[PDB]
Design a binder for this molecule. Sequence first.
Ligand SMILES: Cc1ncc(COP(=O)(O)O)c(/C=N/[C@@H](C[C@@]2(Cl)C(=O)Nc3ccccc32)C(=O)O)c1O
Ligand SMILES: Cc1ncc(COP(=O)(O)O)c(/C=N/[C@@H](C[C@@]2(Cl)C(=O)Nc3ccccc32)C(=O)O)c1O
Ligand SMILES: Cc1ncc(COP(=O)(O)O)c(/C=N/[C@@H](C[C@@]2(Cl)C(=O)Nc3ccccc32)C(=O)O)c1O
Lengths: 544, 543, 543, 51
Amino acid sequence: KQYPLNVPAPHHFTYAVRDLPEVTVEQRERALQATHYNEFAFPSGMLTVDMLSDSGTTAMTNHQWASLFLGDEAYGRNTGYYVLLDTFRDIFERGGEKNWKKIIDLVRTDCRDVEKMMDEVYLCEYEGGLFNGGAAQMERPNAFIIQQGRAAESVLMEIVRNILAKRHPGKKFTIPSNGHFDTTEGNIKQMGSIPRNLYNKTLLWETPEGGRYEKNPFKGNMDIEKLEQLIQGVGPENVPLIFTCITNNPVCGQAVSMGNLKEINRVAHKYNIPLVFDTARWAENAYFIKMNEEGYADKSIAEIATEMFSYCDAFTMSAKKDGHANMGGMLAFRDKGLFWKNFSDFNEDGTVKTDVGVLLKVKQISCYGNDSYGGMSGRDIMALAVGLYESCDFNYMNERVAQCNYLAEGFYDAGVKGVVLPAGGHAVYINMDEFFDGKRGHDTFAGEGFSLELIRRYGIRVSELGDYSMEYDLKTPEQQAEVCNVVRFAIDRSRLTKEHLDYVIAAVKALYEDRENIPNMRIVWGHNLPMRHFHAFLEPYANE
Amino acid sequence: KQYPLNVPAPHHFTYAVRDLPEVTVEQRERALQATHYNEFAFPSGMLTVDMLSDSGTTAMTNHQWASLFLGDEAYGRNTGYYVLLDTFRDIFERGGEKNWKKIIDLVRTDCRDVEKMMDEVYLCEYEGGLFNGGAAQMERPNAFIIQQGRAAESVLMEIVRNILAKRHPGKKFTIPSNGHFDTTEGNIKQMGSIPRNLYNKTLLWETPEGGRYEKNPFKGNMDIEKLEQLIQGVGPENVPLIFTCITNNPVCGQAVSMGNLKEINRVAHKYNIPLVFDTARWAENAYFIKMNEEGYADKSIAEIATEMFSYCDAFTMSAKKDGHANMGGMLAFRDKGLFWKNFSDFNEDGTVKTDVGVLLKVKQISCYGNDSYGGMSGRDIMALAVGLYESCDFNYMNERVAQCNYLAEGFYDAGVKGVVLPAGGHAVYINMDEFFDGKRGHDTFAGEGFSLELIRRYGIRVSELGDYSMEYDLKTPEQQAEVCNVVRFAIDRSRLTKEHLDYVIAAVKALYEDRENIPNMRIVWGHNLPMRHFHAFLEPYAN
Amino acid sequence: QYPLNVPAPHHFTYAVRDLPEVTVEQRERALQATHYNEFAFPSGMLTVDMLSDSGTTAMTNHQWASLFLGDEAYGRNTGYYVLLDTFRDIFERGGEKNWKKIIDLVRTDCRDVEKMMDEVYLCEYEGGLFNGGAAQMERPNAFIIQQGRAAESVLMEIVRNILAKRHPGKKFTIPSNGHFDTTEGNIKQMGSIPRNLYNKTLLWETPEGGRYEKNPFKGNMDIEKLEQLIQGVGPENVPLIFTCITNNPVCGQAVSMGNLKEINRVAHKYNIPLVFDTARWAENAYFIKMNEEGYADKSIAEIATEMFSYCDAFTMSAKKDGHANMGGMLAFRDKGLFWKNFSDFNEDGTVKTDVGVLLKVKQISCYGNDSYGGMSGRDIMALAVGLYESCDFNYMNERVAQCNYLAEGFYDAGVKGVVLPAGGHAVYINMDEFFDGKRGHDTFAGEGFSLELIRRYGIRVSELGDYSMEYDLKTPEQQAEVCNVVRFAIDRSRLTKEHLDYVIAAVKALYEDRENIPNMRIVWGHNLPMRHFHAFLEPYANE
Amino acid sequence: KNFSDFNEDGTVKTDVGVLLKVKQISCYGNDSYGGMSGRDIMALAVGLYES
Ligand SMILES: Cc1ncc(COP(=O)(O)O)c(/C=N/[C@@H](C[C@@]2(Cl)C(=O)Nc3ccccc32)C(=O)O)c1O
Ligand SMILES: Cc1ncc(COP(=O)(O)O)c(/C=N/[C@@H](C[C@@]2(Cl)C(=O)Nc3ccccc32)C(=O)O)c1O
Ligand SMILES: Cc1ncc(COP(=O)(O)O)c(/C=N/[C@@H](C[C@@]2(Cl)C(=O)Nc3ccccc32)C(=O)O)c1O
């Protein structure tokens, strides 16, 4: 029996609330100058809608809050370490809710059977996949809990550099990807390697009839020709790792398809090159696949998640995104997989001599913390495990992405030009070139003035992720052609509602209609710093 | 500098979230019949939008959740006892934020000066108002913490009934109000007393041009003429108390102006009749006064709240409403005021013989709990104190009532017949005589069939507060003329967003366009029970 | 007054957690299944876990209340300002009388935005350890980070890059009163040479009765040895001088203020920046206040500001004396000695490369934004509350009393090798005096002691002797500073006398059976950096 | 049996349970929570197992 309506039934409600401050325009002018016009230095408690980053900003579910009280703060082998690892196993290896072990439920039900705990939690042995356990994790470490994504990439990048520097001193390598985001690209350039972003920058800027594609075209896909012309061009022996980002955050958070991941796997393994996933927004990407890629409409997000991860030899993850949590990170690689083969040292008789996993662990434990908590508190570790399961839920993710489509189609319906469609899984992007109608030069940095104008006028903070923040003027010509000149409106998970989005639409429309009066922005300090958009001082000036 | 927009800035955001269930129509229909078609017995774990009641259903603020951990669970004199009493003093006696002592901040800042805590919290003396403190509260007790409003009313009504029985055995008294609710009225008929609702039932149904009153007309006001005509018709000696509800919950949660309060106070004290306020929705009312009544536009909720309460001799409050909380109640009377003079007994020389405040305290402690917690946990007492300060915040209350305005205008702009206007401060009401175009009877109980259809089809729960749940059939002809045949959509404080509201608007519009399909309901068990909507069994037949 | 021999209690249990019911055989199985690595043993199976006091604290109710005030914004969450200014209060403002406690504005829910800009967001501070506002942007000298090893690792990395693009090849020496295995491991992995300069003869001294009259401050750095090594190796080859308070390597032993002053003078004598590791500052301050002359009237907070005046830079693991489960901090004096030696300047004289900026680029690219530095927003708030709790004399006086009670319980029970007096966080036993000379350095019998505590009694402790400090992997000079002790670290606020009585009895029994404690053989990872977190062991009987 | 009233044929006329429920609901709270907060209910349920 059906009683349909032209509006959907909500699937969550506000469990607890938090008030927003009352701030004048004039007060936000004082704070802007007082902080050198750096978005990252503007006070949070002076804002009305904060869309700076979806990283760590989530509103937890009531079950996550409950779980804080189940966290274990012991220094060695706190119980959440086992629970976290087997939650990764559940979502990314087991394949389907019907296959989950959900040992988190032994902690949630206050199990007091020590024997059962031993046999199903503490002493379980796993080998052969992304997450060893028991003595196998001790003998062949391959999973590394850490505070966040950049810490996971940096522990990884350092090890790779050390090893490469020993085997090929003074040689620099090219590490391509579909989209290296500022953290990853900056940590790469800092290691000495050359990053490259291979995608179809042409499809990116097409917008569909009526404003809404009928199917999502997966604009985050890696161009497979470009990837193989790059490998044959510079030499495969010069390409030590291949990266893929899911979803593609640099390329306007656009989805990446399962067939695309299968191609990257083919090309990469063709040349014996380990393939590393950046999987911060794994669950948004799984959702786009289910909703758009033929054959995947009746598989679950948990199913698609395991399948996507079958194609990688390693991955880095900031769980502060689709962990639906406020902290967490993870680095893992296939047990005795392609990444472990190339980067370990072997004896003549075939036995391992230097395990890359041991080198990684040594760095983890000297720079971040014991492997059992990775620089997280015990309670954050339990809330993260719960949060990762929440991201598997269709109705939650359906509403999470419905919010992005609403903001983008709002920007469109209101006559804002240069709105990238469809929306990414976490954010809506605006092409600043089409926005100012090509009346500003790549060194105007007007996209930065647009962002500071949102703050000054409306208490809305966004993130310029184009020429200025991607360091257009400090890159090579090929890298310059790979820059998307876009401003980003990121949507915190579970924290905002239609009323926040309607106000942002109204305010963007107003700023559009007054775009001539948006200033340009001049760097007055830090123009050359690594990842300068976190450090540099700015100064506005009018256009001429 | 101003940068105007045609959309208001948001004033809060979601701190934490809870998921709603995935439920079929077949599943809800199965549960409706397993539970005899009583909406209070329907499992809330199966609802999509629950609008049964705003009482206790609030999403707390994060500062309230923090206060929980500051709660003191001791049996005698928990610190929360003092904090809560003095929070009542700040809001209802001290006249404005600038006059608040906010001793809750000594708890919040972990003050460890025993001397300072002694002088500013534990040992303070207060007398002469609604909340005695220290030795005064022991000698002349006049404030009683208790877990909710119906408990606050019951203690008062029992002690009033006992005093009236011993002094006037056999006399049946009349007690008027602008509107007594099902619990209040039911608790008064259970004494054997005659409750009466004196309001302008004609003003009530007036729909305004366009559906937007330029100013709130205060349809909750008591009819002063009708009040005098009742005091003189029954004789002052037969009116031992005068009640006044703010907002007027029974009369479509309609606003009550401050001039009205001044008048009721005058008429009452002309006859030496103590005036008791039901103040569950004080802060929504203070907002309506500020936004609509001449000369108060520049006054804060908190100022207006002190001024309202100055016109009363006692009050009962269910703090589960405008206390932004999930539990809490309060009963108080002015120290040595008119309520204490007419209900205490004195010696020949005029000193007190039997103190009515002691008679309520003995009842409080023997049936509810010690006067330092009154049936509440210690953490709930702290969270209540924080919550009552939050209800004074203009922007919070301005956005709370906006939701109700939004939902009623939604109903109107969709062409549903019977939307009372303006909306309540907590709920929107629909007149079911106007919904069905006069095509259903007072015994068809079509209002219950509507509320239950909302559940079956849409997983929306509402409260029929009309003929059935007000026992129109079990009332005197005089009282049947004051019965409002309306269904109520109550909005939980801070829990719902626009998304929830648009869904309800859509669902009601669809059911309005399917009026004839809404079955009738026939009570099959109960009917002659006090407050029978909370327990009666029901069954549907076609019209 | 009415004295009693029994002290009065100064805290109680706010909430409880149950412990597991486990058998010897279950524990023996888990030990074999986890290679006999004490860090791989499941905490879920333990009765009393004394592996580490770091991050294992039971928070106060006010800290738990704190968690709900944490701000999870990416850019400049409010907790960033509150935490910085808590460091200013405790470590720069010289006593409670001069604190600002801006955390109280958060805890009382300040909604006056101008007040918040002028007292929190836009404050300017320069000239000390914690710049604020544009100063902290222009000359960054404070860095929030998840824990101490991340702090020292960001220092030591930046120093290494400088000392190499300046003195290529050269290998420098970094003295300290006692570098911990974390600091030493990181120094050694940087290429430099750690060295710990203290009086090992004093350390083993016993007081007649097992109770000293005044703490002899055996963690003090040997003033003579320091100038001998600086003159020996040459000033230009000592780039930094560390100092640990309390001295964790040297049995968590207290360090006097006089000694900090002396180390200050010798260090500027040759223009060497002085760098304090202050993980356990509060207990060191408490040892000063009770033992040095003319400090008995000074409170913890005054002594903490004073101690900190003598450093040019500090690293801190707030997971210890911050009464918290996560948190670290790196800081240095604004335009101070450390900033002068390690920045690069123009001929004009302006800074050319600010060492502060280099540290910030590292922090931001490898840990997290400087506004949260890899911490969640609620852990920032709770850390700020916890640092204030560590200044309270009654807390810190019951905390250290649990160590005295444990060491003196061992002594009273005939156990031999108990270092004295107890440290501020733990009790240390010398394994040589324990086994009465009858075990060799290569026997690792201390690790057999620790593992046997697990097997029979569910007690986990840590070996910090010739196995974990890597005796056989060090120069002989380094080998003589190695302390052969097993540590009993006492979690802050988590345990009670009942737990200690049981560890006391369990150690007495296992001392009386020390003839039967196995020796430990490293089967794998004998050479790994910080091998006690990695290595595999196997038990073997003693011959 | 003792405190309810019964009809001639044998069936209940005045059920004592119903009388107790009317008093519960008019003086303390709905039977669903009886004057307790929702969270106090759940923590009580956990508490009783613990005992
Ligand atoms: C694909 C991908 N890979 C790795 C990481 C690092 O993970 P982690 O260490 O932070 O947890 C991220 C994190 N992205 C963030 C947060 C942050 Cl500073 C940032 O990192 N870049 C940036 C740009 C503009 C505003 C704010 C930010 C975001 O999307 O806004 C990522 O998107
Ligand atoms: C003005 C006023 N004064 C005192 C009290 C007593 O307070 P308390 O004991 O419950 O805390 C209340 C109670 N209000 C509730 C709950 C309840 Cl059963 C009811 O009483 N009437 C009603 C109508 C429809 C659905 C459910 C209900 C509510 O408004 O929905 C009140 O409205
Ligand atoms: C003076 C000083 N400087 C830096 C740090 C690092 O701080 P952080 O990064 O861990 O937060 C510490 C902390 N020491 C800890 C943690 C640790 Cl691994 C250890 O170092 N030795 C050991 C032995 C058994 C269990 C755990 C441990 C402790 O002894 O309890 C310190 O005392």
